Write an enzyme that holds these catalytic residues in place. Structure first.
Site, PDB file in Angstrom:
ATOM      1  N   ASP A 106       0.845  -1.185   0.000  1.00  0.00           N
ATOM      2  CA  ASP A 106       0.000   0.000   0.000  1.00  0.00           C
ATOM      3  C   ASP A 106       0.887   1.244   0.000  1.00  0.00           C
ATOM      4  OD1 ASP A 106      -2.419  -1.238   0.009  1.00  0.00           O
ATOM      5  OD2 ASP A 106      -2.826  -0.960   2.158  1.00  0.00           O
ATOM      6  N   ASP A 108       0.842   3.720   1.782  1.00  0.00           N
ATOM      7  CA  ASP A 108       0.531   4.338   3.062  1.00  0.00           C
ATOM      8  C   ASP A 108       1.695   4.086   4.010  1.00  0.00           C
ATOM      9  OD1 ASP A 108       0.258   1.678   4.065  1.00  0.00           O
ATOM     10  OD2 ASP A 108      -1.920   1.720   3.896  1.00  0.00           O
ATOM     11  N   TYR A 307     -20.851 -10.450  19.809  1.00  0.00           N
ATOM     12  CA  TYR A 307     -21.734 -11.010  20.824  1.00  0.00           C
ATOM     13  C   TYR A 307     -21.653 -10.231  22.129  1.00  0.00           C
ATOM     14  CZ  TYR A 307     -21.993 -14.787  17.481  1.00  0.00           C
ATOM     15  OH  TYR A 307     -22.197 -15.526  16.332  1.00  0.00           O
TER      16      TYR A 307
HETATM   17 MG   LIG Z   1      -2.920  -0.217   4.232  1.00  0.00          MG
END
Ligand SMILES: [Mg+2]
Ligand SMILES: O=C1c2ccccc2C(=O)c2c(NCCNCCO)ccc(NCCNCCO)c21
Ligand SMILES: O=C1c2ccccc2C(=O)c2c(NCCNCCO)ccc(NCCNCCO)c21
Ligand SMILES: [Mg+2]
Ligand SMILES: [Mg+2]
Ligand SMILES: [Mg+2]
Ligand SMILES: [Mg+2]
Ligand SMILES: [Mg+2]
Lengths: 664, 664
Positions: A106, A108, A307
DNA sequence: AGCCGAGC
DNA sequence: TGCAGCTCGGCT
DNA sequence: AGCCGAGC
DNA sequence: TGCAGCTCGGCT
């Protein structure tokens, strides 16, 4: 071969090996885009292999760890790498199945971090390989302007890789990151194909390192990390009067506050915010409705987020008063307004639940402090007096915390000698979990080990889900030795707690180290006090605007029921001009809001026809008058007064909430 | 004897010892219930009670391949833990000497899916060791613990009627008997509806408990004739409508939204998968996807199995959704309640039979349903024809964007062919695969064997896109002539048959019915939908009528106010309400109409003061007349006219949407 | 050696 | 982040 | 010897 | 439905 998820290159392992590229992707999804990006044609020279999540830092990982790591071994087998074998000449390189590794993450910061850990992996084992140009990256035909070559260019690259990934360069990383943060402040006041490893480290990876701090190390002001702050902001916006599935709350936060990460981390953060057992939160802002974990396992026994349910604590808006929201600076993620840079609570939350986190270069650790003790000190400082010193304090902890030195504490559990054959253990030191104590202390004491003898004859357990009771049997002889040696010592019921890392972001956004919690308390106090002044200025302006608005409305209603004014069949334009000429004020509340960054008479003419009736006229007068008295009652209050009100309300409810907790 | 490599087991302390046959193994439904049994047993219970959790439905061992039985983890685990051996009679008391446990106690949810797991476990023991059922090997623990004995039901074997009950439930040979079994149940329940222990036998478990699951299996798996939905699907739509998202939502988030909003009582993963299924649009999936696939929802390459995780893809309503399911018709639906909450209707009533469009399909107990897709425009045109009293044309299955051929062999029998063309005397080209043959599967199972092996082809290349299929296949001139001598579609397996003799659906009354032809389904749908256009008209005449009356009164009041004919200024509420009555103003006409299956003048008196101004008086008069015309216009139309208007609107947006798809 | 927790 | 298999009936 | 899909 | 491990720093 024989490795799942690997799409081995056709010509790999053969006489075209060194012209073959292994593409390592961050995630299966990136792999399958590489696959469709190759087409049929690329499969001869290009292989692809996905990695899930961050990989091992091999540079100072243990040997068991390195040999057992799935990913690293898979990369070694696929490429043909061999430990210890350097790749100096050209007969060496004839042993590889691939000639290049192309990292596709990515675009990022966490992506950069994986790139880094991979680079680190090669550089530490086969630095020679780095020089031949072994590593490339695929940034996200055009497909060649997306490829970037990592270039080795001298020993300033060995230094940079080591700066990022060596356990011996922590101090260097602090300096490194201190320089970075200092620069970016300067840039904020003013304005604004080959890649060397040094440039990668010092221009790309450092962005991960910084982002890691910004997300792992809390703010002094509210005690929150940005993810936790998003959870609160979302809960405040929702205003749920009944419980919500945690998993559902997570998706809501992701959506309402532009959280850009895996929702699992959010759900875990939510569970950590709600937990209320001995050694977690002194005041949980979220309600643990369901199994959120217990002191038996340090919360590791929480049920799955689909839950379990949560909702705000009644103490939340008491600690973070809604009105103060008008004083916050709310951030923006692409034209959507999200959570604020910080909240401004009435007491310093960072001290109450004891912030903690791990970044790059620094880490934070703060213990819990007593909420009533902090309230009393804030009241002291409101009086001009000095705050009393504070010791760490854990809600419902039955043991003792004694000062040993500067920022160092002895935390002791409870053990009482019952008879000559029996001791009783009724408290474990904070953050010693019951199951863990049983398995790591009492069991070895009962059974002995290869390295230690048995010390006790039996133990029996009588815990509840929130308390601890062990009854231990011993021979008179062994008990007598244990006492002489020190019972808490022998029974591991005494641990130390050292707080030399109180690192927080101050209100400007600056990472600071705090030497004492009084420093934290005092910096918080000065800021909260000025925000009480901001709140007063805001309420006077707003309440005043509302007063004016009611006066104009009430004046119209009266001018109407006396025939002094008529709107009947008058045109929009003439109605507006009539109103102007009679000195009716344009929307005062709107005008006021406007002055916080055509004439509007809708606040008048949007009133219902009921407004003209007898009871409604009376009721409108009583409200107009009541607002006037409310403006004045507020002006009579000092910021200190407003604060003292908040604190009183909080304590009333804190008493009620803790009292109901001891009954339930 | 002990047990080692079964991580999730808590063996009874005395299990495998002399006190074996007094030990009980508790099998739970999921790890959650395993932990509640562990707590419930405490420390005392750990001696005679074992606990082992099963995740998921388990293998039906009666009629399962030998391979399936040997490779299955749960069955083999139960066998090791208990010490059972295949093909051994446990008749005497010596034969029981080889068991590590004397009984199994089944602990499941007290819902229909729990009953199914119980039954399958019973089936397991029954089929391998009937012997053991006589001795009372099986028990169960009923649940919403120290009052265990009231919760503890024993299963009793009473005679060959118990064998027959179990066989009827779990044997592949008794499908027909299950049809009869459930037909009686559905009938008895239809009748009761009109009007008004410690030792459970197997026959009574099957016929009073398991049958409740079998029926629920049908109710959730077999679609309704009316809207072509199953309850899960209906709940998703109901939620989408209620939400009216104007932008995309994450699939995971929408699932949580559905669960909350529609009382969905099941795991959300199933719902996320249902959502993905509703949104798919590749060749062979939906002809009209009611939800939009915004992200990777799977492709024809893998049959949609290549969809991304529900947390990384987005959806919202197609613009076609409310055209097919018009909002105004919601007023005619019978909405269901889940304990003080209104949820999805018993069915929606779309404007063409959606059950034919996307081709319903499901598997229940006793029955299953398959229906192929039909062309939307053909259906619209058959609806129009029947509206004009003509005969409906017979319909062939049609799959949107399928380039091949569907030919009718006979009633409910079709041959579906892909496309194969001779390019030269060495070369063939495959440009369409038959409907529901996925590309990777065809390659792996057909082409590969032909290239490898007695090998029929010399090579093949692929030129697929995401949505289209293109193989170029190279053959020997002799082999082609042979391949061309037999069927080219036959040799290359590009012809499949489609047979539709199980078009089972719930009718509008909730009865399960087997339809023989789609024409039958069409007629029944048609008679009901025409009848609901009648209802919509009556409903609209009534409501628009009330609205007209409401506006009449409102306009009247306004005109009387602007003329002095009436005044409200300074009048008490009572005098004003009493005055309005005396002048014949009508209590809220719409409210009254709605209630119809003191006087209220709020609809007049809540009007803004703006109402009395020139422009607003004219706008009110125009609105009043507009509504007048609207009631009158509607009264003159037939139900059939209304239907044609909706169809015309639907087709216009279908042409627009489908055009935009063939460009993007 | 392994905890703490917000990311992958 | 992705990994793991069964039911049930009709059909091939 | 396995698809189809709504459950666990 | 539950299963799988790594980072980064301080300190036990
Ligand atoms: Mg990422
Ligand atoms: O890779 C992941 C992962 C990736 C993205 C989001 C979450 C995870 C993840 O949870 C995970 C594992 N979870 C187990 C329990 N810990 C709870 C925290 O979420 C376990 C393994 C795992 N990846 C395996 C390979 N990493 C080994 C290092 O080279 C992930
Ligand atoms: O047990 C489950 C399970 C239980 C409750 C909800 C979901 C699952 C589940 O997904 C699952 C598996 N998923 C694989 C993907 N297929 C699509 C469905 O989501 C795989 C195995 C599994 N349980 C294993 C035990 N069953 C063995 C039969 O004897 C589950
Ligand atoms: Mg904390
Ligand atoms: Mg259940
Ligand atoms: Mg379908
Ligand atoms: Mg079958
Ligand atoms: Mg470390």
């Amino acid at each position: 071969k024989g490795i799942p998820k690997l799409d081995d290159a056709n010509d790999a392992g053969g006489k075209h090996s060194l012209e073959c590229t292994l593409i390592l992707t961050e995630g299966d999804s990136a792999k399958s885009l590489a696959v469709s990006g190759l087409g049929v044609i690329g499969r001869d020279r290009y292989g692809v292999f996905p990695l899930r999540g961050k990989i091992l830092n091999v540079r100072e990982a243990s040997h068991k760890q390195i040999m057992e790591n799935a990913e690293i071994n898979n990369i070694i087998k696929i490429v043909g790498l061999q430990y210890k074998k350097s790749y100096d000449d050209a007969e060496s390189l004839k042993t590889l199945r691939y000639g290049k590794i192309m990292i596709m993450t990515d675009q990022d910061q966490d992506g950069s971090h994986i790139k880094g850990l991979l680079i680190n992996f090669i550089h530490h084992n086969w630095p020679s390989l780095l020089k031949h140009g072994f590593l490339e990256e695929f940034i996200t035909a055009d497909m060649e302007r997306h490829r970037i070559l990592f270039r080795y260019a001298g020993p300033e690259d060995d230094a940079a890789i080591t700066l990022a990934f060596s356990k011996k360069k922590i101090d260097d990383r602090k300096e490194w990151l201190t320089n970075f943060m200092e620069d970016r402040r300067q840039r904020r006041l003013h304005g604004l194909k080959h890649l060397t490893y040094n440039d990668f480290i010092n221009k790309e990876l450092i962005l991960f390192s910084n982002s890691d701090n910004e997300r792992s190390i809390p703010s002094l002001v509210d005690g929150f990390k940005p993810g936790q702050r998003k959870v609160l902001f979302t809960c405040f916006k929702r205003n749920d009067k009944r419980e919500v599935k945690v998993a559902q709350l997570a998706g809501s936060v992701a959506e309402m506050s532009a959280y850009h990460h895996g929702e699992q981390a959010l759900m875990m953060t939510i569970v950590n915010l709600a937990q209320n057992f001995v050694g977690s939160n002194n005041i949980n802002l979220l309600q643990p409705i369901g199994q959120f974990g217990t002191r038996l396992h340090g919360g590791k026994d929480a049920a799955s987020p689909r839950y379990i349910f949560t909702m705000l604590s009644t103490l939340a808006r008491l600690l973070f008063p809604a009105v103060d929201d008008n004083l916050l600076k709310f951030l923006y993620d692409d034209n959507q307004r999200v959570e604020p840079e910080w909240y401004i609570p009435i007491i310093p939350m960072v001290l109450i639940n004891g912030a903690e986190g791990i970044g790059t270069g620094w880490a934070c650790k703060l213990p819990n402090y007593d909420a009533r003790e902090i309230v009393n000190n804030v009241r002291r400082m409101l009086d001009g007096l000095d705050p009393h010193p504070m010791l760490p304090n854990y809600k419902n902890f039955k043991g003792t915390i004694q000062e040993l030195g500067q920022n160092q504490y002895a935390v002791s559990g409870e053990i009482f000698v019952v008879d000559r054959n029996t001791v009783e253990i009724t408290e474990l030191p904070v953050r010693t979990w019951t199951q863990v104590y049983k398995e790591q202390v009492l069991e070895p004491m009962l059974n002995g080990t290869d390295k230690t003898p048995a010390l006790i004859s039996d133990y029996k357990e009588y815990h509840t889900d929130t308390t601890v009771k062990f009854v231990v049997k011993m021979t008179e002889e062994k008990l007598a030795q244990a006492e002489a040696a020190g019972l808490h010592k022998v029974f591991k019921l005494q641990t130390t707690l050292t707080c030399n890392s109180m690192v927080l972001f101050d209100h400007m956004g600056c990472l600071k180290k705090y030497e004492t919690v009084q420093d934290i308390l005092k910096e918080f106090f000065d800021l909260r006090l000025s925000y009480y002044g901001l709140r007063k200025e805001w309420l006077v302006g707003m309440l005043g605007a509302e007063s004016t608005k009611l006066n104009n409305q009430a004046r119209f209603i009266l001018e109407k029921i006396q025939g002094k004014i008529t709107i009947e069949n008058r045109s929009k334009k003439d109605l507006i001009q009539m109103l102007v000429q009679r000195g009716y004020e344009s929307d005062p509340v709107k005008a006021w809001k406007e002055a916080q960054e055509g004439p509007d008479f809708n606040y008048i003419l949007n009133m219902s026809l009921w407004s003209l009736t007898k009871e409604k006229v009376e009721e409108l007068i009583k409200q107009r008058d009541a607002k006037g008295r409310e403006v004045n009652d507020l002006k009579r209050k000092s910021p200190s007064d407003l604060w003292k009100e908040d604190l009183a309300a909080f304590v009333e409810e804190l008493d009620k909430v803790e009292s109901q907790e001891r009954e339930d």
